[PDB]
Amino acid sequence: PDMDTSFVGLTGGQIFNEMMSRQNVDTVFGYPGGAILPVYDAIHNSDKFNFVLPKHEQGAGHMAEGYARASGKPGVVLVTSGPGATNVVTPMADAFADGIPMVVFTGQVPTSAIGTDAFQEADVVGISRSCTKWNVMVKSVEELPLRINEAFEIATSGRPGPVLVDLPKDVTAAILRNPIPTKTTLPSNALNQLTSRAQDEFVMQSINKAADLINLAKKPVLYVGAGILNHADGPRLLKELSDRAQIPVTTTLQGLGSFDQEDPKSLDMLGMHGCATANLAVQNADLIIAVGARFDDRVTGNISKFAPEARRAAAEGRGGIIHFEVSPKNINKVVQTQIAVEGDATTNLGKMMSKIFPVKERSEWFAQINKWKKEYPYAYMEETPGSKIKPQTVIKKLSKVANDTGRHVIVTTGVGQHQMWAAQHWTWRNPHTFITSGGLGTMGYGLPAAIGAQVAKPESLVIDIDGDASFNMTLTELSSAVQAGTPVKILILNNEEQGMVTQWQSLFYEHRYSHTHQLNPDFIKLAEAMGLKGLRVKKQEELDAKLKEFVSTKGPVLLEVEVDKKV
């Protein structure tokens, strides 16, 4: 039928509630206030949704991020006007940089008060314009389902990202009196979507040219990033291709977990803080197959000397770069490409799979590299009798202790040295288990991301590997964890005695001279004040028992490890 009457007689708040169900939302992160009251009241006390409350709206925002990254669903945020809205700008910017689907609803002053400098009237659509894929102010209750459907579709398509929908108080309190078009109330499908001959042929041409090229070269590497994780079936098809054509796999920071690092063909992470084996494979390589990765500055060296062996194979028409990329703009934006395969990376891998010649082996490649490893494993000064505890050692031990439980394990982090140590020294096996702020690098991300991930995956063991300065940013959310019941495991690598700011350093043995020390709280007393268990390690001898207790503990728990200040 043309018109939809099902919402007639409902308030905007009740329509919002119905629309969340139609979008298969079962979790909302948010915080009350006068402007959002009509919606908050319709949602907060409803059997249909788990409404998770932070102590600060920024915490709702990062919780929604961790929920989205752990679940593959959009994270939904509900906050009030004015400071409620301006408080979620950092999580929006964070979600925008990392391509995370987030739908932010902000209460607003009534439509009739817009542009009068009313109490808590902020220009939220203007403020959030550069850090959302799209935003809108809803102007009448008739328009509310439309904008909700548009918000969820835009957030979850192309490269996923945050969107904002501004909700004037008079609009959500109003009752819908008349029918509205059915087109505007039904969610988009994007599933069983028809395409034309023209469209089909276009992609298949680029698919054939790349299928023949991989089949050509036999010094290739798969260079994989976050985009392979944006389809349920990405990692499976990635391993399928890796196996079939015996192709070594290296990932970005944001692609960690998309490939089993135990697999003999794993190169692990590449770039500035990546391992030498991966990087050398890339300066070499006649063919880089880039899959859902954007060639960030920290991954590529200088562009010029970056993968010249691939550039030479390109000039000799025998290799180069293939880019499986969903957003045409990011194609040839940083490095110039030979073949572009536009669209969803996983879908295009699938289409391409049959056209791939099964490969025996490459051992001047495979038996090679496998020796690059020996001469360049990750190296750090390891403990000696009496020495301080090394953070890398903590992370390796913790990885093993978590693995021993046989549980699904999800790791979030703060931002800093501990973030890279986590990336490097944990052994990554499963998709959607490393949840870290990579594109914006938001300190304070770790704890609320862990809480939202835990809500997404109640059976998972969720560990926040955090820094002391990062953790201070958002530590009020400890009580949120206790209130939500989420049994997150919060690890603080406390290296407070070295400064936050490097003033200079030795040329070689990176002895760092630093300043700017923050005064930390007592983290164990803090944890107990907030209602959770606190554990502390001061010496090597107690590390193993405390890590075991940390992981074994029922309920949320904080473990502080005092660590050595020099890497």
Ligand X SMILES: Cc1ncc(C[n+]2csc(CCOP(=O)(O)OP(=O)(O)O)c2C)c(N)n1
Ligand Y SMILES: Cc1cc2nc3c(=O)[nH]c(=O)nc-3n(C[C@H](O)[C@H](O)[C@H](O)COP(=O)(O)OP(=O)(O)OC[C@H]3O[C@@H](n4cnc5c(N)ncnc54)[C@H](O)[C@@H]3O)c2cc1C
Annotated binding site for FAD: 159, 273-294, 325-344
Compose the 79-108 pattern: x for residues touching a second copy by CB under 8 A, - for all others: ---xx--xx-xx--xx--x-----------
Compose the 37-66 pattern: x for residues touching ligand X by CB under 6 A, - for all others: --------------------x---------
Residue among 70, 140, 154, 142 nearest 104 (CA): 154
Please tell me the distance from the alpha carbon of residue 152 to that of residue 208, in angstroms, as a whole number. 33
Please tell me the distance from the alpha carbon of residue 260 to that of residue 383, in angstroms, as a whole number. 28
Shortest CB 66 distance to a second copy, Å: 16
**Is 255 near a second copy (CB under 8 A)?**
no
Tokens of 214: 């991989």
For residue 169, the Cα-to-chain-centroid distance in whole angstroms is 32
Options 133, 169, 351, 396, the catalytic residue: 169
Which one among 269, 291, 415, 423 touches ligand X, defined by CB under 6 A?
415
Q: Could you give phi then psi for residue 32, rounded to 5 degrees?
A: -75, 165
Report angle CA 370, 372, 376 to the nearest 5 degrees. Answer: 125
Clarify whether 309 is annotated catalytic. no
**Is 417 near ligand X (CB under 6 A)?**
yes
Which one among 81, 254, 348, 495 touches Mg ion, defined by CB under 5 A?
495
Options 3, 48, 119, 505, the catalytic residue: 119
Please tell me the distance from the alpha carbon of residue 398 to that of residue 400, in angstroms, as a whole number. 5
- Give me the long-range contacts of 362-366 (CB less than 8 A, separation at least 24): 362/218, 362/219, 362/246, 365/218, 365/219, 365/248, 366/246, 366/248, 366/264, 366/265
**Is 530 near a second copy (CB under 8 A)?**
yes
Choose from a second copy, ligand Y, ligand X, none: what does 475 bind? Cβ within 5-8 Å by kind. Answer: a second copy
Clarify whether 525 is annotated catalytic. no
- Kindly report the number of other CB atoms within 10 A of residue 287's CB atom: 26
Clarify whether 539 is annotated catalytic. no
Q: How far is CA 347 from CA 31, 321, 343, 460, in A?
A: 38, 19, 8, 28
Choose from ligand X, ligand Y, a second copy, none: what does 526 bind? Cβ within 5-8 Å by kind. Answer: a second copy
Please identify, using beta-carbon distances, which residue of 51 and 376 lies nearer to ligand Y. Answer: 376
Please identify, using beta-carbon distances, which residue of 62 and 418 lies nearer to ligand X. Answer: 418
Options 120, 246, 392, 498, the catalytic residue: 120
**Is 495 near ligand X (CB under 6 A)?**
yes
Q: Letter for the amino acid at 115?
A: G
Clarify whether 530 is annotated catalytic. no
Contact criterion met (CB below 8 Å) for 555 and 487: yes
Please tell me the distance from the alpha carbon of residue 228 to that of residue 211, in angstroms, as a whole number. 18
Clarify whether 120 is annotated catalytic. yes
Active site residues: 57, 119-120, 169, 500
Residues in contact with a second copy by CB under 8 A are 32, 37, 40-41, 44-45, 53, 55-56, 58, 82-83, 86-87, 89-90, 93-94, 97, 117-120, 122-123, 126-131, 294, 296-298, 439-444, 472-476, 478-480, 482-483, 500-501, 503, 515-516, 518-523, 525-526, 528-531
